[PDB]
Amino acid sequence: AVVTAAGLAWLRQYLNPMGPDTTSVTGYPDGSAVTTCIADYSNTFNVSFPPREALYCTGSSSSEKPTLVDADNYAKIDKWSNYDITLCVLALPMLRNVVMLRLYPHTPTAFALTEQTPNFPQRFPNWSVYSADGTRFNNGDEPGYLQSYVYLPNVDKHLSAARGYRLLSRGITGIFSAPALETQGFVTACQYLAEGSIQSQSIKSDAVRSVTVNSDGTVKNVESSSQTVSSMPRYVFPLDGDNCAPSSLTETYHQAYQSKATDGFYMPVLSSSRDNPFHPPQPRAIAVYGSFLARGCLDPVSEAHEADGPTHDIYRLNVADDVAPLFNTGVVWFEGISPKFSLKLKTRTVLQYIPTSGSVLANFTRHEPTYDQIALDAADRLRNLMPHAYPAAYNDWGWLGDLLDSAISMLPGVGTVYNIAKPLIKPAWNWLGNKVSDFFGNPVARDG
Amino acid sequence: AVVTAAGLAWLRQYLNPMGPDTTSVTGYPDGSAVTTCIADYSNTFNVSFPPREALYCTGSSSSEKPTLVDADNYAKIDKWSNYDITLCVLALPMLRNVVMLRLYPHTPTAFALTEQTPNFPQRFPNWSVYSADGTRFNNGDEPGYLQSYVYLPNVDKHLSAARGYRLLSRGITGIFSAPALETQGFVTACQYLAEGSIQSQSIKSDAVRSVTVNSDGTVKNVESSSQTVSSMPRYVFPLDGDNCAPSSLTETYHQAYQSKATDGFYMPVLSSSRDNPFHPPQPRAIAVYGSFLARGCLDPVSEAHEADGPTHDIYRLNVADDVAPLFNTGVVWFEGISPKFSLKLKTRTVLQYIPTSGSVLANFTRHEPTYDQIALDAADRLRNLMPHAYPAAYNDWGWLGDLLDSAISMLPGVGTVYNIAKPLIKPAWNWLGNKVSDFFGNPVARDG
Amino acid sequence: GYLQSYVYLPNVDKHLSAARGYRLLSRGITGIFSAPALETQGFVTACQYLAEGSIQSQSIKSDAVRSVTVNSDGTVKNVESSSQTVSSMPRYVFPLDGDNCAPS
């Protein structure tokens, strides 16, 4: 009838993963009655304009031979560094490979993805180049953008030795800095559910064509093996790359966060469901849904045109991982950024494990099978009205917890004891104009 | 002014490491304000009379060539198995190598140690033979006893990746079993502080003696390099091997535990100090102090006899480890044991770490900088009146905690709120005669 | 690779020479930072921790003499192995974790 302490702690760490008060770590309040070990991974990365030494090509040049550095095509990327640039970060719900960084000479119209599988995608300190025409980059082409994955190795090590897992919370902080008189730029951030699933794309086989012209050998096996079959199963994400441009995200989602570049960002990615069950680690190749070209059976056609129906393009990422289901995909854009910028990415990922017998995690187990329906219902309440992101320095929200959680905890059903906690009003998160008001109307003076 | 919950939990896990209620794991109550990860290692070993396949020689035979099995000198050890035997376990404060097991044909007069460094000391499943004359054993000698070390590998792995460590508690349980009509034997256990330190023994160099007889070569360098220098530094333990016989331990220490063999033992080893600071992992070669032979400058002598003064023998164990300082050394003896016995050794070692950045421990940290002076003062109170060991089945002591800890918590200073908790009387731990009374006079009926 | 220097107090040496005993009462270090305008970027981190040093001597090795006397009457052949392990000069050693002294 009242929210417990463990439920409140879980709610605070779920909504504010990188808050200063979040020191203790608590599990999901479902009373699973299983031996669990909760792991907290805090990582920091300093991303700036990469040098030539950490830049590789994804084209067919690096097909069999391993990663190849740029053959001093770095002059074009220096030309990029002449003017302002754009920096996209894309946080898919993958456990390792927490975010994908991408660098553009200028803001693109869409989050494009190469149709051919890239060769040797690079972890964060190294980058991989992609051409301007939306294809993989070989030496001598025109570079279009740079891409890298921010990888957590300890997550991989611990996921190997676990019966099951579930993501408890994840937050990404974007401390931005630039030289004086070069602080111009804008930051946008948005979360939305891209519910991926295990799917296989439709591919075609090859028909054999043998013409035996021998006097006794005249088989002439002209059989048509060119039928339509299913490819290897992959975990495909329905992220709308064509609608991932910053302006579309701002005008589509009301909780999207916009501010000046110097404010940075702080995205506490949120789950889209109220139940968070354990899952066995099942890494798979990740892919992203594209769009279809041939209408196929979308119009009255014949049998032969059934096969080439609305088959959506699947973009292989050449990255294997197991994803946290029902968790939002985040995307932030830094537009018009000075090329000599500096972004301190600080990611906190807290997730629960069921240890395997004889594994390392078995030495850190913790028996807290606490249960709290009120906390879960409050999270389901709050999911639809929290902002998608906050300024990087906006931690330790006063309204959270003793007011916001308390105010939202008595709507669920009528399971309420205290008559009235506090009236709740619609906040206005206008960081660009310095007219920010919280959920209770109290103003937010700038703390940074 | 009152003991907190965390302090009580730490006290209970420190005094009763293997109690059934000790499920949660808690750190030292000093408020260190450091990121810590507490690791609990529970290990079980089934020790019986070893077969010939797991028996190696420590003599000069296995000097360069690795461990050598016994060349069917196992007939003498079978002759040992004809009659009753003795089994000593020695728990030094070493973190890994939790205990040292030793098997004797009959009870020795002292805990002897070989003067020459043994070759390839063996972890528990294997044993190493030592001769009857207190020397290392080669094939064809007379076996005197068997020795092995019980090794914890996970402790080594976690100690590698740590800035600092401290031992929180350690308990050793000795579940004893034997065939029916072969349950005869006695068990003795005793703890005492053997405060080791980094010391180097006094050794001698070799003087060069060159006689050049050539017509032009007549140097004759007769210089005396045979001076007294210091050897390699080693962590030396002042354990009194000559006074480690069971009878001497029983008649020396009042809290020493004695019972029938079938009762087993349960030794919660205790610290000898009230402060338990963090220490960096600094593994070193372990050695044990012996006794001196030449009196040297203990009598009026000349300069030349200064060197051969009271130089105590140092027995190298050929084992490297880092020890937990200020923790008691435990020793248990099973005398007159049937050779076809079976001992289930169950060791629980809980210790705190400061994780190194990027290490495995960093994924299991837990921020509980709790402070409790009352708990530490109560431990300092209780150290001198708890029994050194209990019967193997004597867990979940009723008197502990809500009575014993409460009764002892109001002596420290006068920082007392409750007027009187419970009067405290002198217990009588007579397990041999079944006349056991606890700290409050309540009798202890046999639960096993 | 890098530059290193020690900040030395001579009066402390002079006064420590003429003293039976000493003890440190307190010590503070202030770091007033300045830079040209539009060049103020950077971060500062500070941490204290106990590195309890002690007088220790490292383990070193001696050199074994190898003399081959080939003379008709001189055939000593002192091949004695002086290459044993001994202790070096005692030094005050600090257990500061250099590998874990990175700012992060």
UniProtKB/TrEMBL annotation, chain C:
- Superkingdom of this protein's organism: Viruses
Subcellular compartments: Virion
The UniProt entry's sequence similarity note says: Belongs to the peptidase A6 family.
Spell out the protein name for this chain.
Answer: Capsid protein alpha
The species is Lake Sinai virus 2
Q: What is the lineage of its organism?
A: Viruses, Riboviria, Orthornavirae, Kitrinoviricota, Magsaviricetes
